[PDB]
Amino acid sequence: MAQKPLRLLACGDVEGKFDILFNRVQAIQKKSGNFDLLLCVGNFFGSTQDAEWEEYKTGIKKAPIQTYVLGANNQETVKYFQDADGCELAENITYLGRKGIFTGSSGLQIVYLSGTESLNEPVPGYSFSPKDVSSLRMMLCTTSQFKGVDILLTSPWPKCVGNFGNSSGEVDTKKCGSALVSSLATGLKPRYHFAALEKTYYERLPYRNHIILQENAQHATRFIALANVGNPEKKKYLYAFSIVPMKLMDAAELVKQPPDVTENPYRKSGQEASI
Amino acid sequence: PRYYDILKKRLQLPVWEYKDRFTDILVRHQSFVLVGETGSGKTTQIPQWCVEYMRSLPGPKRGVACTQPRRVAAMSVAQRVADEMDVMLGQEVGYSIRFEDCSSAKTILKYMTDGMLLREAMNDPLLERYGVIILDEAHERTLATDILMGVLKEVVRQRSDLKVIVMSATLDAGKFQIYFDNCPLLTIPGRTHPVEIFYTPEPERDYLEAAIRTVIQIHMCEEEEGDLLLFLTGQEEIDEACKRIKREVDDLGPEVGDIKIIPLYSTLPPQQQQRIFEPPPPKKQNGAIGRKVVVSTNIAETSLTIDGVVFVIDPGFAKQKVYNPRIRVESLLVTAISKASAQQRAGRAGRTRPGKCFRLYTEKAYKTEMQDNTYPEILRSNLGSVVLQLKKLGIDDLVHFDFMDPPAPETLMRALELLNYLAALNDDGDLTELGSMMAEFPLDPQLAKMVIASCDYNCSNEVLSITAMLSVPQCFVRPTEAKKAADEAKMRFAHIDGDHLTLLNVYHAFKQNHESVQWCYDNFINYRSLMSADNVRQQLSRIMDRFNLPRRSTDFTSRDYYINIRKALVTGYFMQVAHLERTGHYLTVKDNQVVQLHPSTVLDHKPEWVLYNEFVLTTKNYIRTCTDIKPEWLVKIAPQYYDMSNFPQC
Amino acid sequence: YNTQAQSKILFVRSDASREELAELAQQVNPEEIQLGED
Numbered sequence: 001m002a003q004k005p006l007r008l009l010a011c012g013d014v015e016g017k018f019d020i021l022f023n024r025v026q027a028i029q030k031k032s033g034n035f036d037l038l039l040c041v042g043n044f045f046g047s048t049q050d051a052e053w054e055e056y057k058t059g060i061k062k063a064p065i066q067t068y069v070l071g072a073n074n075q076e077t078v079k080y081f082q083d084a085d086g087c088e089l090a091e092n093i094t095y096l097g098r099k100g101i102f103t104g105s106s107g108l109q110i111v112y113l114s115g116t117e118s119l120n121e122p123v124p125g126y127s128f129s130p131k132d133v134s135s136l137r138m139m140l141c142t143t144s145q146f147k148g149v150d151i152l153l154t155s156p157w158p159k160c161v162g163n164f165g166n167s168s169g170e171v172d173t174k175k176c177g178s179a180l181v182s183s184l185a186t187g188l189k190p191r192y193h194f195a196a197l198e199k200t201y202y203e204r205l206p207y208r209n210h211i212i213l214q215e216n217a218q219h220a221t222r223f224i225a226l227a228n229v230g231n232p233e234k235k236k237y238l239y240a241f242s243i244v245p246m247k248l249m250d251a252a253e254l255v256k257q258p259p260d261v262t263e264n265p266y267r268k269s270g271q272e273a274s275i
Numbered sequence: 276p277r278y279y280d281i282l283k284k285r286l287q288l289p290v291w292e293y294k295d296r297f298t299d300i301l302v303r304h305q306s307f308v309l310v311g312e313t314g315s316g317k318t319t320q321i322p323q324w325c326v327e328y329m330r331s332l333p334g335p336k337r338g339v340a341c342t343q344p345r346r347v348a349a350m351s352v353a354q355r356v357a358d359e360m361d362v363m364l365g366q367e368v369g370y371s372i373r374f375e376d377c378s379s380a381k382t383i384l385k386y387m388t389d390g391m392l393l394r395e396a397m398n399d400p401l402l403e404r405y406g407v408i409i410l411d412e413a414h415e416r417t418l419a420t421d422i423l424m425g426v427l428k429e430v431v432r433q434r435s436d437l438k439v440i441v442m443s444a445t446l447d448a449g450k451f452q453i454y455f456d457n458c459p460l461l462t463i464p465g466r467t468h469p470v471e472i473f474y475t476p477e478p479e480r481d482y483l484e485a486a487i488r489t490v491i492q493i494h495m496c497e498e499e500e501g502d503l504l505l506f507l508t509g510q511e512e513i514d515e516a517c518k519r520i521k522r523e524v525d526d527l528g529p530e531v532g533d534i535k536i537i538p539l540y541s542t543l544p545p546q547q548q549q550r551i552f553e554p555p556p557p558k559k560q561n562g563a564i565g566r567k568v569v570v571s572t573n574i575a576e577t578s579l580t581i582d583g584v585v586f587v588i589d590p591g592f593a594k595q596k597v598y599n600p601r602i603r604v605e606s607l608l609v610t611a612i613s614k615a616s617a618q619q620r621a622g623r624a625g626r627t628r629p630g631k632c633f634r635l636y637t638e639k640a641y642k643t644e645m646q647d648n649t650y651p652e653i654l655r656s657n658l659g660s661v662v663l664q665l666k667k668l669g670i671d672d673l674v675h676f677d678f679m680d681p682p683a684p685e686t687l688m689r690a691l692e693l694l695n696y697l698a699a700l701n702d703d704g705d706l707t708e709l710g711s712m713m714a715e716f717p718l719d720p721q722l723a724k725m726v727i728a729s730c731d732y733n734c735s736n737e738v739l740s741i742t743a744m745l746s747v748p749q750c751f752v753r754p755t756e757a758k759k760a761a762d763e764a765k766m767r768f769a770h771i772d773g774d775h776l777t778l779l780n781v782y783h784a785f786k787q788n789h790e791s792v793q794w795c796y797d798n799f800i801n802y803r804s805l806m807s808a809d810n811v812r813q814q815l816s817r818i819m820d821r822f823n824l825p826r827r828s829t830d831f832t833s834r835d836y837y838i839n840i841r842k843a844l845v846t847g848y849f850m851q852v853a854h855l856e857r858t859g860h861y862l863t864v865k866d867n868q869v870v871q872l873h874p875s876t877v878l879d880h881k882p883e884w885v886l887y888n889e890f891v892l893t894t895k896n897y898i899r900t901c902t903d904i905k906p907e908w909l910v911k912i913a914p915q916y917y918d919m920s921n922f923p924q925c
Numbered sequence: 926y927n928t929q930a931q932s933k934i935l936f937v938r939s940d941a942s943r944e945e946l947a948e949l950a951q952q953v954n955p956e957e958i959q960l961g962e963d
Binding site: 469470471472473474475476479485488489492633634635638641 | 931933934935936937938939940941942945946949950
């Protein structure tokens with residue numbers, strides 16, 4: 001049999017607003033059918049001790065869908081994440097860990113990188129290091145048959161992501177973000193890259209993963225940045241999408257470029273590579 | 276059923292959303308401009324609706340003229356639109372082109388060359404055969420089209436029933452609108468899919484190397500299915516490129532997908548030109564994309580739509596006709612294109628699906644160095660053939676006639692000077708009977724005069740053969756790999772007095788060998804040029820017969836046989852003569868240009884005086900198709916030109 | 926360390942084509958599921 005395509009939800013900064021988020025997920029599932037997974041890519045916890053979280057931790061309330069969450073983006077929230085390699089925080093809510101590869105039984109491959117960039121030694125529990133980026137690349141890109149991954153989840157935006165694409169509004173993408181996330185994205189080539197933390201919604205035009213007439217053609221990447229839950233400006237914080245995993249796709253169909261595709265934003269000009 | 280499948284396709288063209296708006300303008304207005312990108316449906320749909328208009332008008336059915344600058348374009352679109360009207364070609368839809376007329380008394384839509392409607396205008400000055408005349412692809416601003424714009428601006432003041440439609444693919448409509456008395460504009464929007472525009476980071480030093488490399492790289496690395504369009508400047512450069520692209524892909528081994536290379540240039544036969552409408556090759560079993568690459572001159576720049584094109588390669592060059600009136604030289608030179616041309620080139624990509632245009636020059640250079648519009652051909656051509664046609668049209672005031680982009684007055688002075696000294700004009704400048712006959716020949720005036728005046732030297736059979744061999748591509752096929760065999764075959768026909776008599780020998784031997792295709796191969800003779808020359812000769816003779824011009828031959832055993840031909844040549848080309856100066860270079864009469872015999876001549880030595888058919892401006896000045904003449908003939912056959920009072924000392 | 930075979934043709938995309946393509950050609954992501962209003 002040819003398998004039915006998966007259906008997924010991606011969520012931005014939750015910020016401790018668990019009741020608002022999960023009621024919305026319940027309403028959508030009642031209306032449009034069941035989704036397989038919810039990926040929460042921003043601040044899951046708020047700054048102040050959250051009475052709401054205690055009801056979920058104890059099992060009085062239960063998440064309506066299997067939820068994977070990215071980690072403690074700051075010092076205030078590190079206490080909620082007990083095991084750095086990942087652990088179940090509450091029923092149907094699982095912390096993926098600092099870094100690793102998740103491969104679902106459908107074949108969906110998700111690579112995740114939690115935290116903000118840091119060069120300090122010892123590495124803080126709320127930060128990622130150059131070692132984290134290098135380790136992920138070696139696990140996947142060293143195999144001669146590597147084409148890319150299905151989904152990359154990071155909390156900060158990649159640095160210089162606004163190059164060649166449409167306007168990112170109020171976020172200056174050259175000054176904000178993490179250069180390591182940009183380098184990681186270039187090597188891993190995700191079909192979807194979800195991010196948050198900048199508290200705004202931005203769906204960038206797709207960019208190609210190959211260099212025209214220098215390398216053989218590769219698939220395009222769609223980068224989507226999500227807003228914070230319950231924001232007053234009503235920016236889009238929950239994104240629903242349906243994906244066939246790369247392993248099941250025909251090679252000719254996978255590499256097809258949309259008409260509005262742009263250049264890869266992270267590629268330096270020919271004068272700067274001389275260093 | 277084939278008509279219905281054509282109908283399903285043609286109804287999707289952008290123009291059909293404007294058919295009612297087109298008809299509303301056409302009935303109410305006498306002149307108007309129609310702008311639409313190439314592939315919008317202009318050449319195919321607009322004249323058919325004019326046939327619908329012309330069929331509903333009462334009275335005698337006048338035809339629809341639609342001009343096409345290019346013979347290849349005119350023939351192929353006439354065939355196509357006959358298929359769109361479900362009629363036979365040469366019945367209700369026909370074509371008429373220089374040296375080939377496929378029309379009849381049923382023809383109500385004729386696609387034609389500019390230089391045939393203008394020639395019909397010389398015989399029907401109000402163009403009464405037509406009720407609608409369509410000036411299509413007028414943004415090329417060809418030499419005969421620019422004249423036709425002014426002729427129709429005269430006729431519209433005299434014929435309120437004639438409708439004139441100027442069709443363009445460029446945004447330069449303001450020139451066309453204002454010139455036809457502030458006529459309306461119908462702008463047909465594009466339905467071209469997006470074309471990505473790529474530039475190189477630095478300027479390429481070898482644009483031919485860059486063209487070959489970019490063609491191969493697209494074929495290997497682009498995942499979209501799609502045909503390639505490589506633009507080049509002309510036949511000889513395409514033929515070497517086609518050989519190079521063949522070698523450089525054959526060395527890449529079996530894994531590369533099949534490429535279908537197809538040349539498209541004006542000297543190809545119709546059956547080979549029609550091959551461009553064939554589908555691309557299929558994708559190979561290994562997944563490698565099958566692609567077509569058309570390596571074309573500017574004949575593919577306008578009027579034509581190659582379905583399946585996704586990738587355009589633009590070197591930015593073409594061959595344009597140039598005339599230098601201060602030295603009376605005509606030449607073909609390779610020149611840069613305009614931004615308008617480069618946008619039209621790029622817009623070929625977006626025709627069947629989204630696509631890409633690879634421009635081999637920097638994006639900075641595109642903004643500040645490329646010209647906005649292509650120069651009108653009248654600004655860069657010898658007006659001698661046009662002034663001869665203009666005077667035959669009753670256009671006496673050649674100075675204040677409304678040219679859309681007027682030629683330099685000096686260039687007009689050269690056209691009058693050429694015709695005055697030929698006795699096609701008198702000293703007052705009026706068109707003589709000799710000129711009026713010369714204009715009817717689809718020839719250059721030098722060639723037209725030479726055919727007519729050769730009757731009095733009893734050698735008009737031979738000169739008509741020479742003119743026909745000159746009115747067609749050069750007849751010696753000289754392959755780079757086969758030069759030795761081609762020259763040794765050519766020397767069997769080489770006449771000592773030069774190339775005109777060598778062309779005569781080739782043509783006579785061709786007719787004596789019963790048009791044999793095999794004999795042409797075995798002697799490296801261009802069978803297609805010769806059949807074209809035979810076609811040219813049989814129609815020019817029908818023009819000669821129309822003017823009762825006697826087809827005469829001199830006795831072949833007479834010493835004066837070749838001598839009389841050489842005298843007859845002087846009657847048209849006495850201005851294109853050079854004298855052998857004491858230091859062994861040649862000096863052209865009056866303009867004093869230092870020239871050399873062209874390396875394709877049969878003349879191994881230098882006569883004291885040579886007549887030449889063509890001046891060839893390159894890295895050196897050459898004169899091509901040269902013949903020995905005696906100086907005592909010059910002062911006797913052309914005393915007005917060879918008056919020693921005004922003639923320079925040479 | 927911070928203190929310390931014919932060459933393929935490189936192509937860079939034009940600026941002008943970007944602006945025209947962004948407005949006219951923004952295709953809605955075919956895989957996106959449109960969530961309703963509250």
